[PDB]
Each structure stands twice: as C-alpha cells, then as structure tokens.
C-alpha cells in the first residue's frame, strides 16, 4: 500500500554541562534505518536496517555532513528562540524537527511534511500545499516572514516532490522483502482469575508489522471500550510490535466475550474467544 519516509531531529541545550545534544533518526514506514548521535566520539550517520547498508561512501559522507550541519543550525536556532521568548540562559530548552513524505501504491506523492516544535509544542509547520506556513505564535510568525523571504517553502517543495519520493521508492525496492511484506499478529486469549468470582481476559497480538493494529473486546456482540484495558503498541525489539487488550469478566461467563483483531497482514479480521 502507501509508504512513508520520515526524519526526526531533537536538539536539547545543556546549560553548564556543555553544548546542546543532537539526535536524529530516519524511518521508512515503521522501520528505523538511520541514526546520528552527537554524543559519539567521531559521530557519523550509521545504518540501522540491512537494505540501507548497500549505499556507498559518498552517501554516508554526505549524510554525516548533513547531520553535523543540522546540529550546528540547531545551536544557532536555539539561541535565537531564547531572544524571541526572552528566556534565560540558565534554562534548558528542546527543539524538535520532523520532515518526510507519504507516497501511494503508485509511488506518487500523497503529501509532504515539515514541522518544528519548541519545548514540546508546535512552532511552525509547512502546509499540505507545500507553499504555505502555519505559525503558532508571534515568534513563529517572525520566522515565517524570514522563511518566506528565503523561499524555504520552495526549497522543501522541490525536495519533497522530487528527491524524497525517488529515494523512498529506491529504499522500498532495495528492502522490498522486509518493507513491503506485512507480518500478521500471532494471537491468543489468556485467562487470569482475579478472585473466585472474577477473572481477567487478555487478548494478545504478537510479532506483527507494521505497528498499525486494532484490538477490541466485545460482550455479546457489544463493544466494551469503557471497560477495556488497552495498552499502547510496543516494539518487541526486533522491528516487530506487540499489543494486548484485557477485560475483567465474571467467572463462568467467558463465552460472552470475544476479541476482535484487525491488522494489515491478516486477510480478514479475526474473532477470538478463550478456549
């Protein structure tokens, strides 16, 4: 189906300790493929997926230069935001950047992304037309004026519409074995007796990809959203994900409860009961 490429950037200033910490990751869909940490002795962009390791030296050289370059711009930008907000040098602040593209099955660009956050809140975001900006406050509006004059939106639009989509399609092709293939969740229902009168039912989805999944509990064909403990999707640690949904039921009434599992890897939605 549709695929996405994303680059995530975080710079955090460290008053007294030293210069700001810079960390960035690259994701194709739900697959981490690159990383850069400024905490390294001789920092370089490194491969975290197999299919990205194919790229030659000029690639890793250019990427590492870009990552180092971004870290430095983040220092310049962090200082600027201090003066904008009249904040103190004693305080630590966070700057967060994400840009990416989404493509369809036809390999055509659905939309392009470029967002920035300051201290965990939205700062300035590139609109879906790739020719306008959304600013959070008067400070972001100051930046908006600069970036319009500097044609940053036109810069990004060229990249998003072109080089982003091309290379994404390349990565998609190079790692088509893992990237395109979807792993269905291994599913079972477990039984956990709380008291003599009450038991807990937990529905499991294990080792699936991508992270996108839906787990629901139903009581007599009726939905139990109010009384369902639904944990966040978690990484298993091997590029796969895990998730469970649990309900508490009265002892002897397990047959009333069904677990419904909807994932991409599954040909059809599943319905599970404790057995």
């Amino acid at each position: 189906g549709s695929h996405s490429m994303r680059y995530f950037h975080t710079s955090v200033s460290r008053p007294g300790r030293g210069e700001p910490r810079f960390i960035t990751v690259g994701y194709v869909d739900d697959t981490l493929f690159v990383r850069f940490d400024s905490d390294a002795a001789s920092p370089r962009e490194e491969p975290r997926a197999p299919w990205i390791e194919q790229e030659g030296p000029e690639y890793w050289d250019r990427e590492t230069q870009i990552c180092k370059a971004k870290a430095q711009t983040d220092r310049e930008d962090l200082r600027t935001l201090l003066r904008y907000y009249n904040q103190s040098e004693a305080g630590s602040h966070t700057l967060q950047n994400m840009y990416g593209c989404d493509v369809g099955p036809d390999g055509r660009l659905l939309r392009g992304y470029h967002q920035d956050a300051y201290d965990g809140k939205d700062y300035i975001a590139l609109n879906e037309d790739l020719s306008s900006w959304t600013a959070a406050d008067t400070a972001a509006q100051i930046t908006q004026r600069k970036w319009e004059a500097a044609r940053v939106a036109e810069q990004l639009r060229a990249y998003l519409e072109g080089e982003c989509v091309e290379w994404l399609r390349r990565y998609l092709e190079n790692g088509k074995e893992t990237l395109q293939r979807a792993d269905p969740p291994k599913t079972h229902v477990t039984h956990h007796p709380i008291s003599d009168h009450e038991a807990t039912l937990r529905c499991w989805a294990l080792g699936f990809y991508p992270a996108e999944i839906t787990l629901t509990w139903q009581r007599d064909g009726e939905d139990q959203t109010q009384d369902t403990e639904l944990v966040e999707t978690r990484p298993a640690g091997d590029r796969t994900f895990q998730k469970w949904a649990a309900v508490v039921v009265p002892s002897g009434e397990e047959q009333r409860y069904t677990c419904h599992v909807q994932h991409e890897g599954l040909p059809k939605p599943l319905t599970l009961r404790w057995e």
């Binding site: 840009y99 940053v152 990249y159």
Partner: peptide
C-alpha cells in the same frame, strides 16, 4: 536521503 536548508 536527507534535506538540508540553505
């Protein structure tokens, strides 16, 4: 491949 601002 990454984008870098001018």
């Amino acid at each position: 491949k990454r984008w870098i601002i001018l």
